[PDB]
Write a protein that binds this DNA or RNA. Structure first.
Ligand SMILES: Nc1ccn([C@@H]2O[C@H](COP(=O)(O)OP(=O)(O)OP(=O)(O)O)[C@@H](O)[C@H]2O)c(=O)n1
Ligand SMILES: [Mg+2]
Ligand SMILES: [Mg+2]
Ligand SMILES: [Mg+2]
Lengths: 1004, 418, 218
DNA sequence: ATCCTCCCCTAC
DNA sequence: AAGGTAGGGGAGGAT
C-alpha cells in the first residue's frame, strides 16, 4: 500500500504498456501495469467535428493560443498580436491518429502521462487499493492512475540490490578475439537487499595442468563441475568454461535493481553472450513482470548526430534490451559525458578520483611506510583512499612510480600502507590508485597456477572499482534529482540534452498559465553579436586584482526585460536617419518606459541603420518562469553544498548545482537555436544587448573610483541606462572602512559578465576587507532590481597573455593572508589536452622564472630575454640528442568523429587505416592518443614541409621502434613560441628562431 | 515506399534541368540532396549554389563580312538601339549583361504574362528600352512561332516590330546592299543596330551588321527632354551629326570627352558609340557641358527645379492647383490615388516628386542631422562633409530646402488623410 | 576450377581460380575447427559449405551480402528457394517487379543474374536462428569478405546493425550500402530501394549495371 | 611575403 | 534528436 518508485519502463510487443517498479516499506517489490495512450490536444470546435470518435476525452480548460511569429515594421503602426481563447480538450487514443488541427504536438506521451495524472517519476505514494487488480505474483494493473496515485506521502528509504561485474579474456599478442580466445576469469560483487556483500572470482580450470588444479583445491579453492553445486561464499572457484558462462547467465537473469559495469555494454556482456550461444543451446532471456513478452539479450548501438551544416555523427553508445525493469548502467558513458580527462580508461579515472597526501612514517632498504589521516589532507580523502586500499594492488607515487603494496593496515580514521619502492628523500608524497605495471601477454604465455591466483586478485579489484566510482560520483543521488526536476523516468535521466529535458517543466508552465505557443510562418536564421570582451591593458600587474562577477547574469536579463516569444510588441527598423528620429520621437510617447523596455540592437539586414525591439513587461511570460524554476533548484543545491563536510559530499553537491547552471543558460541557446520550438531572434539578440549595457555600466562606474576618508566616490554618475527611476544617483556614498585607507581603483580587464578591478595594494587582508565592503555599496546603490554581483577572489601576480589566457595565484574571498593559495591557469598551454607533457613541464619552469625575475626587476642590459632564451636552447638541443624522455610525455589526445565536409580529410583517413589494420577499433565518440614519429635517421632540420604525414595512432601495446625517433621539430617549435611570446624583446628573440628553427617569429 | 520514390524521382527530374530553376525549385533540389545523403550515406548528386540565367546559347558573333546563304526560309526581325532586357514567366525583368534591379512598370509585366500563358514553350521574352519606351524584339519558343506571340503582345499594349517573311530561292551573296533593302523594308521609325534572322527548324539567331570604323570630333554634349524632368544625353560632332547615346553610363565608360576625337562606328543612317576599351573626370565634364543644374539619376539626367504643389498634383494624378487642402479632398474621392499615399511613406513620396535617385539621396540623409517637431522637419545640418565630394550629393543638398517643403506638406496630408 | 584436400568432411573443396589467394588459408582455418562443427547435423549440409567458391570474381561488379546461407529450406547458397516460398526471396521479387513492371512470373533467384555474386558473411548457422556461429567463422568470414570485395565496385550488405563497422573489416575501399534484410519486422525493408541506387551509382562511375529483373523465372 | 580557410579547443 | 557567440593558435594553400 505504501511504495517508493524505482523505475519506469515499457513493453515492445503489439500491445504497449507502461510499467512501474516500486518497493514497499518491508522490502517487497511490486509492479504496476498502466495502459499506454497517444495524447492529442484539440480545440472544442475540432473535438466536436472529429469523424472517428476518440477512445476517451476530457476537458483541459480554457486556454489562450498566441502566434509568436516576428515581423519587422518601418513605422509605429503596430497591430495587436494574434491571440485566441477557447475551451480545449485533451484526448487519448490507444493508436496513432492523424488530426488535421491538433496542437501541442512537441511533447512526449510519457510527459502527458506524468502531468495529466499528477505523478512524479520518483514520488512516494500511499495507493488506493480499489484501483489495483492483481494479475500475477507481485504484479497489478491500474486503469485509473489519476485517483490511484492522488495521495502522496513523505519520502522513505528502501534497500536496493546491485551486481558489479568484470571479466578477463585470454590473448597471446593482440587485443582478444572472441573466435579463438577463451575466457580466463570472471569476477562478481554480489550485494543483496539484506546488505550482505559477497566477493568471488571464477577461474577457468581448462588452462591449468591437472596437478595444478589439485594443488589449487588443496590450498583452499573449491572445484565444481556443474551449476547446482555452486556456492557464492567462496572466494575462488575453479570450473570449466561451460560453468563460467552458465553462472553468468544465472546472475544476469536475476531481477537486480542495478547491474553496473565499466564499458561492459560493448565488451564484457558482448563476449559473454556471443560465446555462450555457440558452446551450448542456452541464451540469456529477459522477461516482463507479467510474462507477456520475452526477449534475448541483444546489444544495440545508438548513434548521436550533430546539428551543423554537415552534421555527421559525433558519439555512440550501447544499450541492453532488457524488459524486466533492471537498469544496466555503464560507467564509461556516464563519466565520458560528465568529466574531462586526457583519456577515459579505468586506470586514468581512478588515478584522478582516488588519491590523497600521505606522510612518510618509516623508511627501509626497499620499503617505505606511508601513513594518512584527516590531519595531513582534506577531510575524507584519507578515508576514501583507505577504503580502496582494501582491494588495491599497486599505489602510484607522485603520479609517476608504480609501487607494489606489501602490507596494508586500515585504521579507524586513516591508513598505513607499506610500498616496495626506492628510498625517496622527502616527507610528503601524493598516493593514488592508477596504472599497473604488469604484462598480461607474458602472463598468458607462462600461464600457471600462481599466475591464475594473482589474476583472480586483479580481477576482483576491477569489479570493485565500479562500486567505488558508483558512490564517488553520487550516481544514485543525481539520478533521482534529475528524474524529479525534468519529469523523466529514472532510466532516461542521463541520455538527453537540453532540447528534451526542459520539456517537463515547460509543459507544466504552459498548462498552469493557460498558454499555447504556435507558429504560422517559416523560421529564418540571422546572425547577432554576443557579449563584450575587453582587451587587457597590461601584461604583468604585480598587484592584487579584485574580481567581481554577476550572479547568473542571463536569467536576470530575461526577468528584467521579460524576454520571451509571446511578450514582444514589435521590431521597428529604419533605413535613414530622418525616419529614425521620427520613430524615436513617437516611440518615447507610444510605449512609456514605466511599462515598456526598448532595446537598441545592431542592424538585422545590411540595408538597415537602426532596429529597436519593444517588449511589454506588464505581464510575465513563459521563459522567465522556466528560468525562475531552474534558479530555485540551483540555489537549493548551493545551500546544501555550504553544509557539506566530507570531500565526497562536497564534490557531489558541487556537481549538481553546476548542472543546473548549464541547463538554465541553455534556455537562451534554445531561443537562438534555429530548430527550436522556443526560437526567437528578437529576444535572443535583445538579451545580449542588455547584457553588454549592464557590463559597461558597472565597469564605467568602477574605472576611476576613489576611496577617501570615509566616503567612496564612483567614477561616473550612477544613472540607470535603461529607464529613469527614483534612485539617488549621487556618486558619493558612505562606507564603513577606516580613515587609514586611501586607494584608487582601475579597470584592467573584463570578460562577458565580470570586471577585473585593480587596487593599488600588495596585501591580501586589506584587499579582502575593502572588496567585501565595496560589494555591499555596489549591490545597494550601483545596481538595480535583481542584478547582483559577488566578490570571487583576489588574483595575485596576475599575468595576461590574451583575451582568453591568463595565470594567477587565487586567494578565495574567505581566505586570509595566512592561507595557501591555489595556482590556477586559464587558456594556457598547461591546461590543454592537445599539446604534451614535455611542453607543460618546461613552460611552467620558464614562466615562473620569468615572473620572479621580471617582477623584482634588474634590466641592466637585456637580462630577462637573454637568460630565458639561452637556457631554453640548451635544454632543447640536449633533449634532441639525449632522447631519454619517455614517449608518454609527447602524446597528444584527439577525438574521432565523422563531422566533416570533404571526405579526404587526413583525420578520417588516419583513423580509418588504423581500424582496418588493428583488432582495436576507434569509435566515433572515443578519444585516442597519437604522436609525431619520424625515421630515426632524419637529422634536425629547419625547413618543415609536411607535418600531418608524421602522425601515427598509438595503442597501449605500441613501442617506439629502433628505427624511429620523436619528431622533435614540431614539439620544440610550439614550446619556443609560447615562451618567446612572454618576452618584450624583438631583436634577440628573432635571432633565436633564425639559429634554432630557421624562421622569423611574429611578435604580437 | 511511394514517399521515398517521390523524393528520388523529383531529385532526378530537377537535376536534369537545373538551368530553369528559381530559388524555390533550387531549395527543393538542395533539400532532396541533403535528404538523400543523410538517408543513404551516399548520394549521386550534390547541392547547387550557382547557374545564373543566360540566353547566350541562342546567339553568336555578329557577321560583318559578305557571306553565302544556301537555305530558303528565314524570318527577319530588327534589333533596336537601346538596352536589352530579358523577362521570365511569372517573374520580374532583368537587364541583360548585369544582374541588377531596374524600374519596370506594371503594364509590361502584365502583358508579358498574358502572352506567356498562351503556351509553355517560351523560354524568355526579349525587350529593348529606348527613351522609356518598350518594344518587344524576340520570344524564342520550341512550339510557338515569332508571329502570334507578337500579335497578342500588341493587343495587350506592347509595341512589336513589322513582321517580315522571306524565302530565298537561289544562292545569294549577302552584302550591304541586301542589308539596306531588308532593313528599310521594315518601315520602322526607331534607330536600329542590327538585323537578326532565324532558320525554320533551329532556335539559333544570327545577326549581321555592316559598319565602318572612324573617328569624329565632338563639338558639344547636350541632353534632350523625353518626359517629365527626364533628359537623355547625346553627342554632337563638329559637322552637326547626332551620335546616339544609350545612357549616362555609356558616355562615362566609353571615356567620352568634349572637343576631342573619339572612336565611333559609322552606319548608313547614323553614328553609334560602342563600349570597349577617369570616371570622376568624365562625369564632371559632361555635367558642366550640359549645365550645372543637371545631375545624374540612374540612366538619365534631371533638373533641380523649385517644384511645388503644381508638380505634386501631377505625381498624385489629381487636379492641378495651388491649394493644400485640395490634396485631401480629391484623394478621398478617387480610390486609385489614395492607395499610393497611404501605402508609401512620406520620405519616398517626397523623394519621388523631386526626382532624386535613391542611393545618393539616402547617402546625403545619413550624413546630416535633423531637428523635428511633431514629426515635421524644422531644421537640419550636415555633420559629415566627406559625402559632399560626390558632385551628386552636393547638388542634391543645394536644393534640399525644396525636399523639406514638400516633405512637410505631405506629412500634413497624411495626418488628415488617414 | 581446381581443388584442394582437407582433413575433414567433405574432404575436398572445389573453387574457381579467382579464389586461389585465400585457399591457402581456408584449409588451415577449417581443419582446426571442423572437428567440432561436423559432429552434429548442420543446415546447410557440410557438403555445400564451400559451394560458393565456384563463382568467378573477375567478371562481377556487385556483391549482395546476407547474414547466412538460409539454413531452413536452404540450398547451400544465399537468396534461393527451390519453390519460391521463402519470405526473403518473395519480397525481393516484389520490390523489383513493382519498379520494373513485371506481372506474370513463377519464381526468382539472385544466382541467375549476371554481374552480381550472391554472398553471406557467416558460412553456417543453426536451424531456426541467425548469427549462431559468429564465434565459429568470424576469422574465416573476414578473409573471404575482404577478398570478394576487392573484385566488385559496390558492396550491398543486409543488416543496419550487422554490418555497421564493415568499413573497418574491409581492406580496400568499396562503395558500401547497408540496407534492411527483406524479412525484418515493422515492414522496414519495404521502403528499401538499394537495388536501384546500386545501378545508378554504377552508371555514374561508368561501370556495367546489374540487370536485377534478370533473376525472374518465367 | 600574405592573407584566407578550416579545425580544435577554450572561455564566457 | 540537435543550446548560443568570441577568440587564439596551427597547418595548408592560392597566390
Ligand atoms: N555554458 C554557458 C555558459 C556561459 N554562457 C553565458 O555566459 C554568461 C556568464 O558566464 P558564467 O559566469 O559561466 O555563467 P553565470 O550564470 O554567470 O554563472 P554564475 O552563477 O557563476 O554567476 C551567462 O550569462 C551565460 C552561456 O551562454 N553558456
Ligand atoms: Mg557571472
Ligand atoms: Mg560567480
Ligand atoms: Mg564569470
Amino acid at each position: 500500500m505504501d511504495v517508493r518508485c524505482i523505475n519506469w519502463f515499457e513493453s515492445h510487443g503489439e500491445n504497449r504498456f507502461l510499467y512501474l517498479k516500486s518497493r514497499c516499506r518491508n522490502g517487497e517489490t511490486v509492479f504496476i501495469r498502466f495502459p499506454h495512450y497517444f495524447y492529442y490536444v484539440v480545440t472544442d470546435e475540432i473535438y466536436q467535428s472529429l469523424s472517428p470518435p476518440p477512445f476517451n476525452a476530457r476537458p483541459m480548460g480554457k486556454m489562450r493560443t498566441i502566434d509568436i511569429d516576428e515581423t519587422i515594421s518601418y513605422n509605429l503602426d503596430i497591430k495587436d498580436r494574434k491571440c485566441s481563447v477557447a475551451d480545449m480538450w485533451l484526448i487519448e487514443e490507444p493508436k496513432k491518429r492523424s488530426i488535421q488541427n491538433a496542437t501541442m504536438d512537441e511533447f512526449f506521451n510519457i510527459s502527458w502521462f506524468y502531468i495529466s495524472n499528477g505523478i512524479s517519476p520518483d514520488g512516494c505514494y500511499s495507493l488506493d487499493e480499489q484501483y489495483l487488480t492483481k494479475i500475477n505474483n507481485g504484479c497489478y494493473h491500474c486503469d485509473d492512475p489519476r485517483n490511484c496515485f492522488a495521495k502522496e506521502i513523505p519520502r522513505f528509504d528502501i534497500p536496493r540490490s546491485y551486481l558489479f561485474l568484470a571479466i578477463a579474456c585470454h590473448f597471446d599478442k593482440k587485443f582478444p578475439s572472441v573466435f579463438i580466445n577463451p575466457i580466463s576469469h570472471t569476477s562478481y560483487c554480489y550485494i543483496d537487499l539484506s546488505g550482505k556483500r559477497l566477493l568471488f572470482t571464477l577461474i577457468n580450470e581448462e588452462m591449468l595442468t591437472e596437478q595444478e588444479i589439485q594443488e589449487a583445491v588443496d590450498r583452499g579453492c573449491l572445484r565444481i563441475q556443474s551449476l547446482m553445486e555452486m556456492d557464492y561464499e567462496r572466494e575462488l572457484v575453479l570450473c570449466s568454461e561451460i560453468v563460467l558462462l552458465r553462472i553468468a547467465k544465472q546472475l544476469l537473469e536475476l531481477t537486480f535493481d542495478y547491474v553496473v559495469t565499466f564499458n561492459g555494454h560493448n565488451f564484457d556482456l558482448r563476449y559473454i553472450t556471443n560465446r555462450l550461444e555457440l558452446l551450448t543451446g542456452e541464451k540469456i532471456i529477459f522477461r516482463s513482470p507479467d510474462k507477456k513478452e520475452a526477449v534475448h539479450l541483444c546489444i544495440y548501438e545508438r548513434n548521436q548526430s550533430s546539428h551543423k551544416g554537415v552534421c555527421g555523427m559525433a558519439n555512440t553508445t550501447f544499450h541492453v534490451n532488457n524488459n524486466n525493469g533492471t537498469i544496466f548502467f555503464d560507467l564509461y558513458s556516464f563519466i565520458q559525458k560528465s568529466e574531462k580527462l586526457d583519456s577515459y580508461k579505468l586506470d586514468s579515472i581512478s588515478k584522478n578520483a582516488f588519491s590523497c597526501m600521505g606522510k612518510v612514517l618509516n623508511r627501509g632498504v626497499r620499503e617505505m611506510t606511508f601513513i594518512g589521516d584527516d590531519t595531513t589532507d582534506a577531510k575524507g580523502k584519507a578515508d576514501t583512499f583507505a577504503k580502496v586500499l582494501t582491494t588495491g594492488n599497486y599505489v602510484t607515487v607522485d603520479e609517476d612510480i608504480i609501487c607494489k603494496v606489501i602490507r596494508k593496515d586500515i585504521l579507524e580514521n586513516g591508513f598505513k600502507v607499506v610500498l616496495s619502492c626506492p628510498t625517496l628523500p622527502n616527507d610528503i608524497y601524493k598516493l593514488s590508485f592508477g596504472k599497473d605495471d604488469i604484462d598480461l601477454a607474458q602472463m598468458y604465455k607462462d600461464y600457471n597456477l600462481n599466475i591464475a591466483l594473482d589474476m583472480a586478485r586483479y580481477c576482483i579489484h576491477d569489479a570493485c572499482l565500479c562500486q567505488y566510482l558508483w558512490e564517488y560520483y553520487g550516481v544514485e543521488t543525481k539520478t533521482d534529482a534529475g528524474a524529479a526536476t525534468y519529469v523523466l523516468p529514472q532510466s532516461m535521466v542521463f541520455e538527453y540534452r537540453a532540447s528534451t529535458i526542459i520539456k517537463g517543466p515547460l509543459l507544466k508552465l504552459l498548462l498552469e498559465t493557460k498558454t499555447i505557443l504556435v507558429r504560422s510562418e517559416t523560421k529564418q536564421k540571422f546572425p547577432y553579436e554576443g557579449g563584450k570582451v575587453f582587451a587587457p591593458k597590461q601584461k604583468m600587474f604585480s598587484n592584487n586584482v579584485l574580481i567581481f562577477d554577476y550572479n547568473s547574469l542571463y536569467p536576470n536579463v530575461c526577468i528584467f526585460g521579460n524576454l520571451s516569444p509571446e511578450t514582444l510588441v514589435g521590431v521597428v527598423v529604419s533605413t535613414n536617419r530622418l525616419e529614425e528620429e521620427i520613430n524615436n520621437q513617437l516611440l518615447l510617447q507610444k510605449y512609456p518606459p514605466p511599462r515598456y523596455i526598448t532595446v537598441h540592437c545592431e542592424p538585422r539586414l545590411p540595408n538597415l541603420i537602426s532596429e529597436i525591439a519593444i517588449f511589454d513587461r506588464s505581464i510575465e511570460g513563459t521563459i522567465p518562469r522556466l528560468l525562475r524554476t531552474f534558479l530555485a533548484e540551483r540555489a537549493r543545491y548551493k545551500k546544501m553544498l555550504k553544509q557539506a563536510t566530507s570531500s565526497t559530499e562536497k564534490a557531489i553537491y558541487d556537481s549538481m548545482q553546476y548542472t543546473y547552471k548549464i541547463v538554465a543558460n541553455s534556455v537562451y541557446g534554445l531561443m537562438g537555436f534555429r530548430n527550436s520550438a522556443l526560437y526567437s531572434y528578437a529576444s535572443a539578440k535583445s538579451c545580449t544587448s542588455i547584457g553588454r549595457r549592464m557590463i559597461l555600466y558597472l565597469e564605467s562606474v568602477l574605472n576611476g573610483a576613489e576611496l577617501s576618508n570615509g566616503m567612496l566616490r564612483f567614477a561616473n554618475t550612477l544613472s540607470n541606462p535603461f529607464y529613469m527611476d527614483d534612485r539617488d544617483i549621487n556618486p558619493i556614498v558612505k562606507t564603513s572602512l577606516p580613515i587609514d585607507y586611501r586607494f584608487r581603483f582601475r579597470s584592467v580587464y573584463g570578460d562577458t559578465d565580470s570586471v577585473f578591478t585593480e587596487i593599488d595594494s600588495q596585501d591580501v587582508d586589506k584587499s579582502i576587507e575593502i572588496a567585501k565592503e565595496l560589494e555591499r555599496l555596489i549591490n545597494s546603490r550601483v545596481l538595480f532590481n535583481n542584478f547582483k554581483i559577488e566578490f570571487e577572489a583576489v588574483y595575485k601576480n596576475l599575468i595576461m597573455q590574451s583575451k582568453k589566457k591568463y595565470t594567477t595565484m587565487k586567494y578565495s574571498a574567505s581566505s586570509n593572508s595566512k592561507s595557501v593559495p591555489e595556482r590556477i591557469n586559464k587558456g594556457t598551454s598547461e591546461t590543454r589536452r592537445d599539446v604534451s607533457k614535455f611542453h607543460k613541464n618546461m613552460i611552467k619552469t620558464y614562466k615562473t622564472r620569468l615572473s620572479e625575475m621580471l617582477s623584482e626587476g634588474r634590466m641592466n642590459s637585456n637580462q630577462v630575454c637573454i637568460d630565458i632564451l639561452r637556457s631554453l636552447e640548451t635544454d632543447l638541443r640536449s633533449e634532441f640528442d639525449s632522447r631519454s624522455s619517455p614517449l608518454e610525455l609527447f602524446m597528444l589526445s584527439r577525438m574521432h568523429h565523422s563531422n566533416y565536409k570533404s571526405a579526404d580529410n587526413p583525420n578520417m583517413y588516419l583513423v580509418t587505416e588504423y581500424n582496418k589494420n588493428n583488432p582495436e577499433t576507434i569509435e566515433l565518440g572515443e578519444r585516442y592518443y597519437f604522436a609525431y614519429i619520424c625515421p630515426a635517421n632524419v637529422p634536425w632540420t629547419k625547413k618543415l614541409v609536411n607535418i600531418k604525414t608524421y602522425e601515427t595512432i598509438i595503442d597501449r601495446s605500441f613501442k617506439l621502434g629502433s628505427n624511429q625517433r620523436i619528431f622533435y621539430e614540431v614539439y620544440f617549435k610550439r614550446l619556443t613560441s609560447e615562451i618567446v611570446n612572454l618576452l618584450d624583446n624583438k631583436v634577440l628573440c628573432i635571432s633565436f628562431f633564425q639559429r634554432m628553427f630557421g624562421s622569423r617569429p611574429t611578435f604580437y | 515506399s511511394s514517399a521515398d520514390l517521390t523524393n528520388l524521382k523529383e531529385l532526378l527530374s530537377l537535376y536534369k534541368s537545373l538551368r530553369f530553376s528559381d530559388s524555390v525549385a533550387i531549395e527543393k533540389y538542395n533539400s532532396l540532396v541533403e535528404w538523400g545523403t543523410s538517408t543513404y550515406w551516399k548520394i549521386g548528386v550534390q547541392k547547387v549554389t550557382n547557374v545564373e540565367t543566360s540566353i547566350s546559347d541562342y546567339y553568336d558573333e555578329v557577321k560583318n563580312k559578305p557571306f553565302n546563304i544556301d537555305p530558303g526560309y528565314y524570318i527577319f526581325l530588327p534589333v533596336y538601339f537601346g538596352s536589352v532586357f530579358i523577362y521570365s514567366k511569372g517573374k520580374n525583368m532583368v537587364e541583360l549583361g548585369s544582374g541588377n534591379s531596374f524600374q519596370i512598370p506594371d503594364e509590361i509585366r502584365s502583358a508579358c504574362n498574358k502572352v506567356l500563358d498562351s503556351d509553355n514553350g517560351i523560354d524568355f521574352l526579349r525587350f529593348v528600352l529606348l527613351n522609356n519606351r518598350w518594344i518587344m524584339e524576340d520570344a524564342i519558343s520550341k512550339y510557338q512561332s515569332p508571329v502570334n506571340i507578337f500579335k497578342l503582345a500588341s493587343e495587350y499594349g506592347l509595341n512589336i516590330p513589322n513582321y517580315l517573311e522571306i524565302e530565298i530561292e537561289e544562292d545569294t551573296l549577302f552584302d550591304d546592299e541586301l542589308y539596306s533593302i531588308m532593313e528599310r523594308s521594315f518601315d520602322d521609325t526607331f534607330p536600329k543596330i542590327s538585323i537578326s534572322y532565324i532558320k525554320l527548324g533551329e532556335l539559333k539567331r544570327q545577326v549581321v551588321d555592316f559598319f565602318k570604323f572612324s573617328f569624329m570630333y565632338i563639338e558639344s554634349i547636350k541632353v534632350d527632354r523625353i518626359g517629365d524632368n527626364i533628359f537623355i544625353p547625346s553627342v554632337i560632332t563638329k559637322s552637326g551629326k547626332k551620335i546616339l547615346v544609350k545612357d549616362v553610363d555609356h558616355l562615362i565608360r566609353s571615356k567620352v570627352r568634349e572637343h576631342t576625337f573619339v572612336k565611333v562606328k559609322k552606319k548608313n543612317t547614323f553614328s553609334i558609340l560602342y563600349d570597349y576599351d577617369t570616371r570622376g573626370e568624365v562625369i564632371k565634364r559632361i555635367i558642366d557641358t550640359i549645365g550645372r543644374d543637371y545631375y545624374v539619376n540612374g540612366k538619365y539626367f534631371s533638373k533641380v527645379g523649385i517644384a511645388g504643389l503644381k508638380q505634386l498634383t501631377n505625381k498624385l494624378d489629381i487636379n492641378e492647383c495651388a491649394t493644400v487642402d485640395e490634396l485631401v479632398d480629391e484623394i478621398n474621392k478617387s480610390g486609385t490615388v489614395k492607395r499610393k499615399i497611404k501605402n508609401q511613406s512620406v520620405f519616398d513620396l517626397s523623394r519621388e516628386c523631386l526626382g532624386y535617385p535613391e542611393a545618393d539621396f539616402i547617402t546625403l540623409v545619413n550624413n546630416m542631422r535633423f531637428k523635428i517637431e511633431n514629426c515635421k522637419v524644422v531644421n537640419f545640418n550636415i555633420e559629415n562633409t566627406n559625402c559632399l565630394n560626390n558632385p551628386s550629393i552636393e547638388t542634391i543638398y543645394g536644393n534640399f530646402n525644396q525636399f523639406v517643403s514638400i516633405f512637410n506638406t505631405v506629412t500634413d496630408v497624411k495626418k488628415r488623410l488617414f | 576450377m581446381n581443388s584442394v584436400t582437407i582433413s575433414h568432411a567433405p574432404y575436398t573443396i572445389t573453387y574457381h581460380d579467382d579464389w586461389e589467394p585465400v585457399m591457402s588459408q581456408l584449409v588451415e582455418f577449417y581443419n582446426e575447427v571442423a572437428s567440432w562443427l561436423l559432429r552434429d547435423e548442420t543446415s546447410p549440409i557440410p557438403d555445400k559449405f564451400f559451394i560458393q567458391l565456384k563463382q568467378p570474381l573477375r567478371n562481377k561488379r556487385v556483391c549482395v551480402c546476407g547474414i547466412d546461407p538460409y539454413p531452413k529450406d536452404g540450398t547451400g547458397v544465399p537468396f534461393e528457394s527451390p519453390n519460391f516460398t521463402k519470405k526473403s526471396i518473395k519480397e525481393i521479387a516484389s520490390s523489383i517487379s513493382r519498379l520494373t513492371g513485371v506481372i506474370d512470373y513463377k519464381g526468382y533467384n539472385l544466382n541467375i543474374i549476371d554481374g552480381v555474386i550472391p554472398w553471406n558473411y557467416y558460412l553456417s548457422c543453426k536451424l531456426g536462428e541467425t548469427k549462431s556461429h559468429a564465434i565459429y567463422w568470424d576469422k574465416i568470414s573476414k578473409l573471404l569478405l575482404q577478398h570478394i570485395t576487392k573484385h566488385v565496385s559496390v558492396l550491398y550488405c543486409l543488416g543496419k546493425t550487422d554490418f555497421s563497422n564493415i568499413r573497418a573489416k574491409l581492406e580496400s575501399p568499396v562503395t558500401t550500402i547497408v540496407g534492411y534484410h527483406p524479412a525484418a519486422r515493422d515492414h522496414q525493408f519495404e521502403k528499401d530501394r538499394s537495388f536501384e541506387i546500386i545501378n545508378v551509382l554504377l552508371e555514374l562511375d561508368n561501370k556495367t549495371p546489374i540487370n536485377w529483373a534478370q533473376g525472374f523465372i518465367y
